[model samples]
Target: GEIEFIESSKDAGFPVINTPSKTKLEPSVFHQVFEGNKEPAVLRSGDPRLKANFEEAIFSKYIGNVNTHVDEYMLEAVDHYAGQLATLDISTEPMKLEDAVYGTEGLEALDLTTSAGYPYVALGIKKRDILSKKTKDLTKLKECMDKYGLNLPMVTYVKDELRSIEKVAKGKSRLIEASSLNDSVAMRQTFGNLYKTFHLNPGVVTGSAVGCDPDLFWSKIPVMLDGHLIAFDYSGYDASLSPVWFACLKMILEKLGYTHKETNYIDYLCNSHHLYRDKHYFVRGGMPSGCSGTSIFNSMINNIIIRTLMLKVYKGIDLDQFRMIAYGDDVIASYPWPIDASLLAEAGKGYGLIMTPEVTWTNVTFLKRYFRADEQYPFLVHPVMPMKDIHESIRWTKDPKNTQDHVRSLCLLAWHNGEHEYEEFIRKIRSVPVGRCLTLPAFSTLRRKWLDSF
Candidate 1:
């Protein structure tokens, strides 16, 4: 028997003429997009060229009420955000688009051993220049870690921090999970060491203001970023897969010597907003994308971002910080202030995340220069780094065809344990209807409600 057919329409970078056919019987044509080399078109309704034609074709046949309200609501939402967040400005002045895209050659390579992640975006502790000083503190790090459950004996005298942790700790535990705890402990050290000293972003107060209820389309992190108006965008991908990035970020925050506890007010807002609750996917029993998956990453990155902003708040730093953006693994740590971009660079180095050498705070750039077109999943830039160098971790790479490797990749996507059942959830959804078919209304409300209420 022939398999069922689904619509494979191309969405060129324009209006899609989505209209109901007036005629009693008109067949919906189908195409195989996944196997094609054709350029996909973005079709929005009411465009000059395809609009009249596509609308004439669809409404010329079928006689169903066009639920254009929900469709238009979604389209308008998409267009508004797509235009608004096209750029994330971080330098002294808006960077030139070309300069942002192609950074200068002979740029300094961050000693990758220390600076892959953000360890200094807003740090107060001046980075030690002497290699001996650096190694000496590292020697004591193991002892410090032992007080926590991080009883790793061989972590001393190791150049590669991630590798040292991996070697010292065994069993299926991830370095990210451990690093989060380590970061919390380290933050305790920072606060304990300088409880009375003038701290960076000291007296940084976080408060809340209420406004219009947010549209469902608002992306989570970006909305969280905005202090005035709300905004968000979604780039579907899993985050737990990247831990070194998490670690790099955490170390940077620790180095910054900024200490902050999540505010009671913030928790109230989050709970009231149900920020940590997501119905899309689950790992163990919590939102896989929320703090359950985020503590490690948050303990790492948020510390840098928040601390740097805190510095701006307290006037400890010279920069006037503003809008910050992060898309999945891509982060944009932007500030309008005379930000000591180098400090943030050092913090990132301490963690495993990388910074492109081409970053310069000296100018304004176009939008394309900021995008990493090569990435498989959507990512936000880490404000200081160019898109190309945004992700330099070894974990991002995949080797040439190997059966075991292929199977492992499959497992990551669709973990069946021992079941011969198909692994991918999308595949499973197609195989069985949960309650109703997936449609815009169902996706917007029913499916989400199902995920949440259930």
Candidate 2:
């Protein structure tokens, strides 16, 4: 019965000319692959194995509804923050407020309030630090600055404008402006140095902190109907972080030459709402998603946590068998069949990344797009549905003229004696009118044609 479902290109009448056709196998054997070895499967055209897996495994699980709504992780993360706030200490280590200076010859401390126009001073100071700390040619730094527009005049201008806005908005809003090197040539240079050091230096071996790149995630994910794939998108992924997670991130940045003053400023900014509201000062979960540093932090933390959770769940399985990719709060992956739902939910708790349970799948109602039906045969996969076929089909059914044209096109698509089932094709068209349909006249014509053809 399973073998009755599959048809070759030649059997469908589109004779293969020169190309060697793909090998065919029974659907039952194909379903066994994922059920047993769980090897990585690549869906290739004409293989039919993917379709087999779809019919036997994926389609069988279809109950017309899948429950994707889960919020346990989000609740857990909130509880974590709640627990820490109850026994928290708003204290810091010894104060070492070093004067922020600039230029080849170190000068006085930087006052950001009045020093908007002199943003280059930080650049000059950082340049000097780079030269002194890391042995590098001055010419190379100059080239990098030129290439990246890191030390341009507009940088300071933008920073000054933002500072003025923040000053005005301080009392009027709950938002506190975080200090940034935005438009600051010197700060940009420092960022460049830190990024380069993190990227190129073999000495810094921090695992899991840097998450999987987006491209890596893209390749590993398999194409399946929406119900089988169980997609989950997290809400407030970056902004909702626990105190311990924030402290962990702070420690990492501190090791990379971030001074206590710099780190403390960030802390204040993150906890500014709490300070302004109840006059209580404490850092919460993680950095704001909008912040400049969040991208790096996401990669560092999400990657490590996701990887660890994946290893925990799929222990002893080959790395190639399973796929896990996370970019901030948006995570997409296909877990092994009979997925460990509870284990997956607990994966990112320590890192304050709550895996939400809002699952969605791509529309599988475009069944016609994947197959052709004929009277002498069942359904065959050939003359595949055109790109944007679903959109076109929707428009066709919606409009009278389009419906007329669509019926005619379908008649031609299933006209073949051996390749397509003429009766089956007409049955599909008449089935559309069984419910309350939009273009009644066009469907009446289709029904008349079906009677005439038979």
Candidate 3:
């Protein structure tokens, strides 16, 4: 086989009728197939090429039911949202698009370290000091415990969860899993201190609205920009937390003049976790990965940093050019004009963040922006036989007593991935009787029940 023949096709933004006769299919074809079949199982699960049904279901209620429903639903949503926006006066104050100011010169180099070559503030509190602080009583701590009904179970549960590898991956475990139990205990106290005070902290409260629901946020905010959809990505964002940023967080607590218990708790959490790598143990400067508090804290700080640069540091920067929503390190922002990624990268340093190379620039279509374009279809097509997705389907189907059940699932996977052309091949493999693909007794019987139930 020619290697070039197997090469995927260029994306054509949206879905179109695709066939083997065509050299390239529009990316939209795959998107249409996907959005049309937008089941929770398909969308949330990974790798559409493997798991998704790229081909039209043989047992579909109608020939074009999925496409029709998807189109109708989308139009209705657009009209509904447009009507809602018409009621607001936001359009009246639209900033001039031409005035979009992006600077390119004299950007400062990012400084992730301090004069001592340390990434974090050198709070020289030893393990004994933190243990002592953890044993101390603070008034705010008592109030928080009372308000939230904090108990021994809660503390123990938190500790267990933290100790588990799932809480923070090895790459980000430097802050919590200290070599010494005293250091670990202090880190726990630090976590509790912050957790209790989080509600009371005005800065953290300001960023509280940044939630875990990416879809809800994405849907609520309009993705359309000047006729195109916009998207973004942050590379190595989980590991990009610099010492200066941690220092800024420390300064906030310092200015507040928190009790000794509170101060040590923060110090321990910031500097206690040991990063054991290359035959040495080192503490990390970045917020530990996998902590919910760290995610929210970073978001809060980044929000302020971005807003300050846009509104205060750089005057006359058109706020209307961008609409942003961030979840931890992942940031999605809509831009009215072409964005200079370098601009954002340089600006990020002012707040102790560094933008990695994984930049997802906006294109004309949302589907094309996120999906792989296919040569024969809008998205990559999966072959039915040889089972490229055997692992997931096996896990999904579980152990089957009968061979026919396994064969049936194989056919199912094939039909979904634009391999309907090879229906005869699947039929032969499954020993399916000669007729319409869905006309097999077992298939039609079950499929009819499924359709009727839906």
Q: Give the number of the best model, judged by TM-score.
A: 3
Question: Which prediction has more favorable lDDT, 2 or 3?
Answer: 2
Sum up the clashes in candidate 3: 10
**Per-candidate RMSD, Å:** 26.6, 25.9, 22.6
TM-score, ranked from best to worst: 3, 2, 1
Model 3, position 34: C-alpha lDDT score: 19
Predicted structure 2: lDDT? 0.34
What TM-score does candidate 1 get on C-alpha atoms?
0.22
Ranked by TM-score, the better of candidates 1 and 3 is: 3
What TM-score, to 2 decimals, does candidate 3 have?
0.36
Report the C-alpha lDDT of model 2 over 157-250, residue by residue, as the tens digit: 1111111222222211112222233223343233433333333321112211123321121112332121234334443454454444444445
Candidate 1 vs 2: which has more TM-score = 2
The positional error of residue 62 in candidate 3, measured at the CA in angstroms, is 56
Q: For candidate 3, give the lDDT of residue 330.
A: 49
Query: 118, model 1: CA deviation in Å?
Result: 30
Worst 10 residues of 2 by lDDT: 154-163
State residue 236's C-alpha deviation in candidate 2, in Å: 1.8
Give one digit per residue, the lDDT tens place, for model 1 in 1-454: 0011212223212212222222111111111211212111212234233323432232121111111122222233223322322221111222232222122221111121231111221122122321133233333333334543421111101111111222222211111111122332332333222211211111111111111111121222233333322112112112212232222332333333322242121121111111010111111111123211232233223333334423533344332234443323333344444444455445433322233312332232212122221122232211122312211111122232332343233322222121232222224333434212432122224323323432
